Amino acid sequence: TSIMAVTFKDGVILGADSRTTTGAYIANRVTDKLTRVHDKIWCCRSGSAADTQAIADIVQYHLELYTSQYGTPSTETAASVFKELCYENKDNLTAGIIVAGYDDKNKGEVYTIPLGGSVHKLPYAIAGSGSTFIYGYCDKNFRENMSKEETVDFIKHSLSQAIKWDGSSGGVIRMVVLTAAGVERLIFYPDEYEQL
Amino acid sequence: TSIMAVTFKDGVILGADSRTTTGAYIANRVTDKLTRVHDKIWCCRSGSAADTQAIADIVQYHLELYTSQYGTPSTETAASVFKELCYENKDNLTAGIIVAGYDDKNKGEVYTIPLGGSVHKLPYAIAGSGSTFIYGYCDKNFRENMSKEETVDFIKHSLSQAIKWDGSSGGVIRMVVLTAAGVERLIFYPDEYEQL
Amino acid sequence: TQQPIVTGTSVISMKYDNGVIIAADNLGSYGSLLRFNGVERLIPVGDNTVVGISGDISDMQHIERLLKDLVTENAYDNPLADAEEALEPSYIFEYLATVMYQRRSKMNPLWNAIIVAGVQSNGDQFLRYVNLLGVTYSSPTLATGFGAHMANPLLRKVVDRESDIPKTTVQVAEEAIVNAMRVLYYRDARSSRNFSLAIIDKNTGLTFKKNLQVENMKWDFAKDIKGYGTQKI
Amino acid sequence: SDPSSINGGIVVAMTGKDCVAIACDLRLGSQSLGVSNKFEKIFHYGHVFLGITGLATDVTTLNEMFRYKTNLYKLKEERAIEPETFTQLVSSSLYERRFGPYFVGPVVAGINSKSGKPFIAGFDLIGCIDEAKDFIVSGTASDQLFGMCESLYEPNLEPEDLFETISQALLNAADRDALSGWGAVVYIIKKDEVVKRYLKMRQD
Amino acid sequence: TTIVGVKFNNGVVIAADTRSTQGPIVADKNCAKLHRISPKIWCAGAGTAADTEAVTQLIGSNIELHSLYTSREPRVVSALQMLKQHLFKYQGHIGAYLIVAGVDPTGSHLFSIHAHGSTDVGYYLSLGSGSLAAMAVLESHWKQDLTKEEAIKLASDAIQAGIWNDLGSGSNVDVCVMEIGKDAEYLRNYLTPNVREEKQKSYKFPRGTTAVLKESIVNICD
Amino acid sequence: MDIILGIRVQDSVILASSKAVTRGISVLKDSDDKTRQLSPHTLMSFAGEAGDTVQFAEYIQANIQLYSIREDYELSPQAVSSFVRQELAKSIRSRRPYQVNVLIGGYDKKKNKPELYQIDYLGTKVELPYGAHGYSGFYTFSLLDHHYRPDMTTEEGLDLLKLCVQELEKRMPMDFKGVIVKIVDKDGIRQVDDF
Amino acid sequence: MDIILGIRVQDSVILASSKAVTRGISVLKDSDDKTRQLSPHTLMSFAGEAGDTVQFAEYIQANIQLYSIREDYELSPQAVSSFVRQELAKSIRSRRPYQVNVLIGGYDKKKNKPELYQIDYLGTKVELPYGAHGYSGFYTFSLLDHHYRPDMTTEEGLDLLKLCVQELEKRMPMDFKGVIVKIVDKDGIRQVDDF
Amino acid sequence: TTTLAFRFQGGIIVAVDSRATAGNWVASQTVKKVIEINPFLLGTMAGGAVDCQFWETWLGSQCRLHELREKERISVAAASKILSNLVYQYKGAGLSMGTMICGYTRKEGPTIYYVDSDGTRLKGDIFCVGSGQTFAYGVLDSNYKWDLSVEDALYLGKRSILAAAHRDAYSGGSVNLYHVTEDGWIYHGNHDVGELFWKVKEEEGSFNNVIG
Amino acid sequence: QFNPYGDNGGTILGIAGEDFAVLAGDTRNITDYSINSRYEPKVFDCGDNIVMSANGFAADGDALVKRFKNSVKWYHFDHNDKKLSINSAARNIQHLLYGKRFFPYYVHTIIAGLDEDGKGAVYSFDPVGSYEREQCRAGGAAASLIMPFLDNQVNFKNQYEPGTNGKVKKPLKYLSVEEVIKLVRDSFTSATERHIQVGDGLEILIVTKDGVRKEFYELKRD
Numbered sequence A, B: 001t002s003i004m005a006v007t008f009k010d011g012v013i014l015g016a017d018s019r020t021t022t023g024a025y026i027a028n029r030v031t032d033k034l035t036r037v038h039d040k041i042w043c044c045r046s047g048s049a050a051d052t053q054a055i056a057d058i059v060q061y062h063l064e065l066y067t068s069q070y071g072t073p074s075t076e077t078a079a080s081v082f083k084e085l086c087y088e089n090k091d092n093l094t095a096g097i098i099v100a101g102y103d104d105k106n107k108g109e110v111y112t113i114p115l116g117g118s119v120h121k122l123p124y125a126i127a128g129s130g131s132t133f134i135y136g137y138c139d140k141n142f143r144e145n146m147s148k149e150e151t152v153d154f155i156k157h158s159l160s161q162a163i164k165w166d167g168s169s170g171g172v173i174r175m176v177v178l179t180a181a182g183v184e185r186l187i188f189y190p191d192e193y194e195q196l
Numbered sequence C: 001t002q003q004p005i006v007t008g009t010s011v012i013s014m015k016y017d018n019g020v021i022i023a024a025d026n027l028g029s030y031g032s033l034l035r036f037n038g039v040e041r042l043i044p045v046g047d048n049t050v051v052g053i054s055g056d057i058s059d060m061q062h063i064e065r066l067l068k069d070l071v072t073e074n075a076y077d078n079p080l081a082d083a084e085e086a087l088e089p090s091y092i093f094e095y096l097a098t099v100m101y102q103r104r105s106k107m108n109p110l111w112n113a114i115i116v117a118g119v120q121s122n123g124d125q126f127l128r129y130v131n132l133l134g135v136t137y138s139s140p141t142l143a144t145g146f147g148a149h150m151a152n153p154l155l156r157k158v159v160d161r162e163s164d165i166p167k168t169t170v171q172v173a174e175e176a177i178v179n180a181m182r183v184l185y186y187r188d189a190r191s192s193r194n195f196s197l198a199i200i201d202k203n204t205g206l207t208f209k210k211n212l213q214v215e216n217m218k219w220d221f222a223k224d225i226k227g228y229g230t231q232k233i
Numbered sequence D: 001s002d003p004s005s006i007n008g009g010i011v012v013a014m015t016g017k018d019c020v021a022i023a024c025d026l027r028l029g030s031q032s033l034g035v036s037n038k039f040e041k042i043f044h045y046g047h048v049f050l051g052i053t054g055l056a057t058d059v060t061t062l063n064e065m066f067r068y069k070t071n072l073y074k075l076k077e078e079r080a081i082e083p084e085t086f087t088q089l090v091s092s093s094l095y096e097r098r099f100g101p102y103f104v105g106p107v108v109a110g111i112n113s114k115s116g117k118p119f120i121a122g123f124d125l126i127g128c129i130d131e132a133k134d135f136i137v138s139g140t141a142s143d144q145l146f147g148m149c150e151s152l153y154e155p156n157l158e159p160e161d162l163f164e165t166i167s168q169a170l171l172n173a174a175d176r177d178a179l180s181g182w183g184a185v186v187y188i189i190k191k192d193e194v195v196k197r198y199l200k201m202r203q204d
Numbered sequence E: 001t002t003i004v005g006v007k008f009n010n011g012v013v014i015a016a017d018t019r020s021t022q023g024p025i026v027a028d029k030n031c032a033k034l035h036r037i038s039p040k041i042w043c044a045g046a047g048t049a050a051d052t053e054a055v056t057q058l059i060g061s062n063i064e065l066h067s068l069y070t071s072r073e074p075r076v077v078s079a080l081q082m083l084k085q086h087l088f089k090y091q092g093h094i095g096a097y098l099i100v101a102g103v104d105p106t107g108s109h110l111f112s113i114h115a116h117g118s119t120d121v122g123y124y125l126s127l128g129s130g131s132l133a134a135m136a137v138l139e140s141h142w143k144q145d146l147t148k149e150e151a152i153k154l155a156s157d158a159i160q161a162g163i164w165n166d167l168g169s170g171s172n173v174d175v176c177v178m179e180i181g182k183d184a185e186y187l188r189n190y191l192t193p194n195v196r197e198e199k200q201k202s203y204k205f206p207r208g209t210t211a212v213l214k215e216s217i218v219n220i221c222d
Numbered sequence F, G: 001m002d003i004i005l006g007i008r009v010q011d012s013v014i015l016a017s018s019k020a021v022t023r024g025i026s027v028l029k030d031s032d033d034k035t036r037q038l039s040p041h042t043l044m045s046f047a048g049e050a051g052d053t054v055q056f057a058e059y060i061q062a063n064i065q066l067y068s069i070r071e072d073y074e075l076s077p078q079a080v081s082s083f084v085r086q087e088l089a090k091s092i093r094s095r096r097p098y099q100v101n102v103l104i105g106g107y108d109k110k111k112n113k114p115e116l117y118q119i120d121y122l123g124t125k126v127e128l129p130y131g132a133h134g135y136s137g138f139y140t141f142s143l144l145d146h147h148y149r150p151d152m153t154t155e156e157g158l159d160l161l162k163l164c165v166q167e168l169e170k171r172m173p174m175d176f177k178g179v180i181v182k183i184v185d186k187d188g189i190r191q192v193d194d195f
Numbered sequence H: 001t002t003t004l005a006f007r008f009q010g011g012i013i014v015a016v017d018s019r020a021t022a023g024n025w026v027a028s029q030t031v032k033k034v035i036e037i038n039p040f041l042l043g044t045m046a047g048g049a050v051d052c053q054f055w056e057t058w059l060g061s062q063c064r065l066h067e068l069r070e071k072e073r074i075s076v077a078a079a080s081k082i083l084s085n086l087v088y089q090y091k092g093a094g095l096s097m098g099t100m101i102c103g104y105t106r107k108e109g110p111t112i113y114y115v116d117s118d119g120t121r122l123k124g125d126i127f128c129v130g131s132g133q134t135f136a137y138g139v140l141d142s143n144y145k146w147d148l149s150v151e152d153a154l155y156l157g158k159r160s161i162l163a164a165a166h167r168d169a170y171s172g173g174s175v176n177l178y179h180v181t182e183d184g185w186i187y188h189g190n191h192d193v194g195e196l197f198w199k200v201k202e203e204e205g206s207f208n209n210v211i212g
Numbered sequence I: 001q002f003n004p005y006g007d008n009g010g011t012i013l014g015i016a017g018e019d020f021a022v023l024a025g026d027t028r029n030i031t032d033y034s035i036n037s038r039y040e041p042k043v044f045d046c047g048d049n050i051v052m053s054a055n056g057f058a059a060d061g062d063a064l065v066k067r068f069k070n071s072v073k074w075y076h077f078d079h080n081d082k083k084l085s086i087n088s089a090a091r092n093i094q095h096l097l098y099g100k101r102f103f104p105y106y107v108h109t110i111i112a113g114l115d116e117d118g119k120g121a122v123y124s125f126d127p128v129g130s131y132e133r134e135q136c137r138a139g140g141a142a143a144s145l146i147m148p149f150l151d152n153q154v155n156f157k158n159q160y161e162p163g164t165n166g167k168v169k170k171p172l173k174y175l176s177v178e179e180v181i182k183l184v185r186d187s188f189t190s191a192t193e194r195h196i197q198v199g200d201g202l203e204i205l206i207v208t209k210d211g212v213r214k215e216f217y218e219l220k221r222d
């Protein structure tokens, strides 16, 4: 994997490639690594497909139950539930999860949860095998309060480079826009992003 | 290490950080990783300090002897001698060497020699532990036939990011300019490059 | 005993009615890092043989030097170096096969899989494989790495046995090869889009095509896939 | 320390024309030491025949266990268990020990008393059913048995011909295996008579 | 094994070869790797043969009880969820690799499941030792808007690639078509392109060839 | 431990068990009885891991004695052997298995027949005319294949046994300090004092 | 191999060496002489790794015999022991060392004195009144500490030796098939036939 | 393998089985484990097949060269020691050989030397060697006397290999018999266990463990 | 760590008649679960009426065959063009194989031809050089499947004369070239069914006093 989430003026955008590997064989070249845990709380998954999937399914259950009793959960709450699972089962999991969501009070928020099970709230976050290659780029090109179109370009260019160097990353770039407007799914094919 | 060499209009520039580590302890924070093997053929050294040092000393000997018999060697010749040592002793060495030199016929040339002992001629080259973090940046920002000042900025910014993320890299940035004019040593201190 | 560092992935090849085709992408991987992108892994020897090499690139470069040196040595005191006593594909192959097996026998292999494709002086097509173990075999279609698993099945639908070779044209054969290279780009995590292709024909000679790309890729269906089971948004 | 080849043994079963055959060797050893030349590996519960190869303590245990279950089956169902049903019972019981398995290679053989169809089946140690028209093999000389059966076998053999075929398959396979042999038993099974013959084979 | 799944206009088709192996030996030349979970949800299995059988029956059993409880026809996502949660619980020690396909009130579906409990979605999928041979055919010929007959052709072509080019696959081709509105049709031995040639000789022995020591009538009666 | 033999003849079962108990480079005892009477017409010899052997023998002994008291009846050698096998078959999949091999020699009073059962620690049972555990078998089985006859007297069985002990003392690397011999017949269990 | 002893008394040196040669679970021989006469008044017993023992003994024997012929003179027990030690000291740092322990018993004709040298495979030499190699020492050294006196006769030395062999046959786990005894005195080397 | 050879009143008996194994796979049932070095010298083979075959055929070449150089047939002691010194040079390399060098010379009389790959070399009257040696020892030792007739000794050797062929899973095939006298070795035929077992069972009344 | 060996599969078969001998072998070459070639011959005419096959690890097999062919060539040069008898070839091959006792050729080797009395001969070797002449031998992957069939059908093992109370054995007799080729083809079709590394093609070399003839037959390609 290459995955990232970026806050901006109107909310937050999650981005991800679509490559799933079993060794050097590509098991699935059109994978959806962007998964919904609530209306406007989504996460990007890196590491073990089985572990991140089972975690995400449990989190979705917890937030559905939270919603029925206490109303819409904060993005921070969602991240805390991810953490509780990742931290307490750290010996049995290989999951690097980025959480992103849109409140109306708090706007766009991004929380990253690396292998240890620690939580880190950030303006933007990168993760997965391909993220190593774009630390320099993303640090140099990220600004706060970007526009939607600026943020889409930032993610598209960033993941393009990650994909270009990381063999474990590739295929299409999927993105998910989280704003007051609603939820927008985006997709960008190789022919477009390769020659950026 | 973070090291790189970049060709440009007037010749070639080699750049490097100054950090030497024994584990997490910094044995030397003002190391000179840019070493002369001939008047206008230099190399950047990554990997084992002992191995790269012994190799460089042997190469310097070979090119001094070459010079006495056949005149000034090409940059390609220097790279071939590095390769011959790195390839034939691949089981006993941990050396990742970048070779850069200035002919008057061939202008600036850069050859990279990774762990295997293979040779790769390139417009620019990056290597060392910190280079992983600037693949995305360098690919996006490198142009051919840059000016001296543009190339100095490219290296300064690139190594600044490598230093920022790689714990095994740091200290000052040293650079060496190879042109028809001569040989110019440059140095850039943390206070300058950190806040780029 | 080695371990390969900078590597090249699949080399694929097949026979057709008049000649042979061979192809290989232009990538030099460094583990999962796609480090080098201008690597030529098809190396012609004379105008009647192409050697395609996969595996460790430093060892490939060494083999390049051997073949280049072989041409030089063959020319020495040889008035018929460009005629009756020119290097044949069978000569080049057996030399490599000899070297490979000696190196494995000294527990110091050249970490490669090689396919020698060419046309003999009598017009016969030559296609034979050799690897780090010194294992050799011949077939109407040959491939290395992932190529063996994904290309061969496709190429064998065209030439399934010896008698299918006269029936196969160069247009059909090249199409199958280019299609195979696309499939490998979809499914091999250490492949690249850019590749080189070489035809050695008994009439038209050696055509060496560089800077080819995989095109006509199906990706559009991706926009319909959501989640991993129960997701609808 | 490979449980499947400490004691040794083989079982083979074939179908014929309105009949089935099941055969086994008689050896029980402790690796190189031959210990018993009387150790039979075929048992029956009513008209359903079960042969079991592998670790002898499990062979014995499983026999005792299936006797147990088929006896309760019969008391409650008020009828003898059929080969198709018994095959499923074996599969269930073996898979119940998925992560602490019996080290065995069972083979079911019998004629359905209602439809009159000949039925054979085999399993791995963990329960996977291997149903077959022609033949099933099991034991330390299974490679050999597969080779003999695949060349010697033909469909629709009469009981007296099938006997010669299954016997020759077993005998010549056992003679190419160090842990199999030391005697042999062959069951020829027809709709309502069962003949049991002990074979003369080389005793080395 | 080689197993495949292919979506088309009004449904989904799955196919499989019919070889079972024990090391380099062919244990079974014609086993059925296509399992019924419910009438209109079928499952193709690769990996540990007993695990694919056991896990498919267990979930099929619970799916039936669930279908009775809810007075509703079972959904593919229910089988998917139950299988994946079960396999995950055992951390891959149950070596089942499955392609799950079927039609339900929601539509037609195609999923894959790996032994550690990860699931994927696709228009075309392949699992098993011959999955790469099959996937090469699927990547070469698959398109959007396949007809029923085009999908069957593609699926069996993908399985054939496995049969011929993979040593872990052989013998025949089984197919199951699940179309919306209709019954699922299980096409056992849809193709049989590996028929054993006539043997040169008959090895039926002269009667009395085998030396016998003892005879006895066995009592199966009461 | 190490050497335990058994020979079933016409009218009796003869068990021979070595007397040595060794640990390290010291023979701690040279007069050890490696047997327990399970019931008046049933005797069990044992060999294997230290501690386990006796603990197992005495556990089996108590169980059979409990049965005898409860039913006021002696269990058949076949039934005792089946009970013992089942216990060992349980044991092998336990947390710590009993590493004990046994021979059960008994006279069945209902059949008027001697019976010899060989059972290893895995729970592998066989009825034999003659039996052995450990390396002993590698010499005795072939010797008995040659010299043993089914219709032999108790006296002929003892001569056949001396022939086994002689061969073992000649070719075995360890000093096992001779054997204690016991006979099991219709009149019960008795020990031969001079061997 | 395994058991080799030595006792130096007033006027002689007595060497006792076990007769058994074993491999696996078979005693292949029960009459093996684990000794070589190096010279008329010098005898070497040996024990250790199979093959090495004899190869080493015979190699040493040839060398000493060569010396005797060249100088027409017998080397002193002290000199022979020093030669043997040096060979073993070389061996231990070789590619494949001789894994052989020895006892050298000799009568020095110049001093008119018996001498007993104990040398292990590492090349560790000591002159002793009594010596042993292997597990034997763990029983015999303490026994001899108690019963041995420096002024004993050859006959008293043999009784003291019987006392050692008796203890070993009682407490040692392996059957070593008795010993061959040899005496080394002013009149040369002779073997006791009944022991 | 089971092999034996023993000394008695009337010379030397040598008997061997004929099975070759590759693990539990039976490789052959018709293998020659005795080599006739010369008319007065025999060699038996147990362990690695080629190790024994190659080096005992080599031994024969060395014995042949000795009689060309010395105009005299090599002693059993010297022939056995050539083989033992050879294998000792290879000690540690992983050779596997259990051999017996049997023969007659005027100066020695009938003589048997046991030679193995650890470098052990032993003169003796009786040896059994191989995976089935213990089974052979059991029968031989309990029926051996010095005063056996040639007829009885021949049979005892045959019966001892048969005993091992039966019990030892890694022995069988057939018995090869030899008798060695002052006049050289005499071959006493190949005896397939397939027929011999039943012939012996019936005539001797033994092997009552088997279902007859 | 570098593993200098590999398994290229295949299987070979030698049968000897009265005045002829056959050496058969399948033409399939494999590594792991892949087919490298459907027609890669491994039975060779080596001159002097000797045919040879070295099955197992192909690189070691080709190396050995190549060296023996060379051995025959130098035998002619050094000994006045004398014919290398089959027994002499066998012994020569023992020394080739044993020369690498501590780094073996991973091959089971078979040669066939005629002895010095004009009778058919088959010699077979282990990987390190031990050899034996037989009427009958299979080698390689499916040896375990084929060999007991040959024991039964060529040497008539376990076959008694009918009605003789299992007392009189079926008598040994030489087989015709027609009968031998039937057994070869049935042996290989049987082996092909049940072993995954055996298939594609069968190639037989027949050796008479008139020379070496070839015969080829298709095998199942799954």
Ligand SMILES: *[C@@](C)(CO)[C@](*)(O)[C@H](Cc1ccccc1)NC(=O)[C@H](Cc1ccc(OC)cc1)NC(=O)[C@H](C)NC(=O)CN1CCOCC1
Binding pocket: A001, A002, A019, A020, A021, A022, A023, A027, A031, A032, A033, A045, A046, A047, A048, A049, A050, A052, A094, A128, A129, A130, A168, A169, E114, E116, E118
């Ligand atoms: C990239 C490859 C590297 O981080 C991504 O993290 C990617 C994330 C992903 C993929 C699909 C769906 C959601 C998220 N990870 C993978 O594709 C993953 C590679 C991986 C496997 C195991 C790991 O540690 C245990 C870490 C990364 N692929 C898989 O999980 C596939 C489906 N399964 C296997 O490869 C089988 N594994 C199971 C665990 O044991 C090793 C073999």
Ligand SMILES: *[C@@](C)(CO)[C@](*)(O)[C@H](Cc1ccccc1)NC(=O)[C@H](Cc1ccc(OC)cc1)NC(=O)[C@H](C)NC(=O)CN1CCOCC1
Binding pocket: B001, B002, B019, B020, B021, B022, B023, B027, B031, B032, B033, B045, B046, B047, B048, B049, B050, B052, B094, B128, B129, B130, B168, B169
């Ligand atoms: C960075 C750290 C990572 O590539 C650079 O390559 C840097 C290069 C350098 C440093 C000084 C002078 C010239 C070039 N490498 C190091 O600083 C190096 C770290 C390193 C050590 C060993 C390696 O593989 C064998 C690879 C990288 N530091 C050293 O060599 C120091 C001086 N020595 C040690 O740490 C002692 N080593 C010796 C080898 O065994 C491990 C302990």
Ligand SMILES: *[C@@](C)(CO)[C@](*)(O)[C@H](Cc1ccccc1)NC(=O)[C@H](Cc1ccc(OC)cc1)NC(=O)[C@H](C)NC(=O)CN1CCOCC1
Binding pocket: D124, D125, D126, D128, E001, E002, E019, E020, E021, E022, E023, E027, E031, E032, E033, E045, E046, E047, E048, E049, E050, E052, E053, E095, E128, E129, E168, E169
């Ligand atoms: C192809 C043939 C793989 O080569 C398929 O995946 C096939 C799937 C299948 C499904 C249902 C019915 C038949 C066949 N898999 C097998 O046939 C499978 C191959 C396999 C064996 C063992 C494995 O783990 C080491 C993994 C894959 N064969 C079996 O399951 C056979 C019947 N069983 C055994 O060999 C017993 N093994 C099972 C695993 O545990 C150890 C003992």
Ligand SMILES: *[C@@](C)(CO)[C@](*)(O)[C@H](Cc1ccccc1)NC(=O)[C@H](Cc1ccc(OC)cc1)NC(=O)[C@H](C)NC(=O)CN1CCOCC1
Binding pocket: H001, H002, H019, H020, H021, H022, H023, H027, H031, H032, H033, H045, H046, H047, H048, H049, H050, H052, H053, H094, H095, H096, H130, H131, H170, H171, I126, I127, I128, I130
């Ligand atoms: C009995 C049967 C026990 O094996 C005998 O010892 C028998 C003796 C014998 C003598 C001459 C001719 C044939 C047989 N030994 C074998 O049959 C022997 C068993 C054995 C194998 C390997 C060993 O390794 C140290 C030791 C003993 N079998 C073989 O030699 C077989 C035919 N060949 C191989 O196993 C090939 N191996 C040999 C060792 O190197 C690797 C390849």
Ligand SMILES: [Mg+2]
Binding pocket: A163, A164, A165, A166, A167, A168, A169, A170
């Ligand atoms: Mg990529």
Ligand SMILES: [Mg+2]
Binding pocket: D174, D175, D176, D177, D178, D179, D180, D181, D182, D204
């Ligand atoms: Mg057998």
Ligand SMILES: [Mg+2]
Binding pocket: D203, D204, H164, H165, H166, H167, H168, H169, H170, H171, H172
């Ligand atoms: Mg046997």
Ligand SMILES: [Mg+2]
Binding pocket: I191, I192, I193, I194, I195, I196, I197, I198, I199, I220, I222
């Ligand atoms: Mg096949």
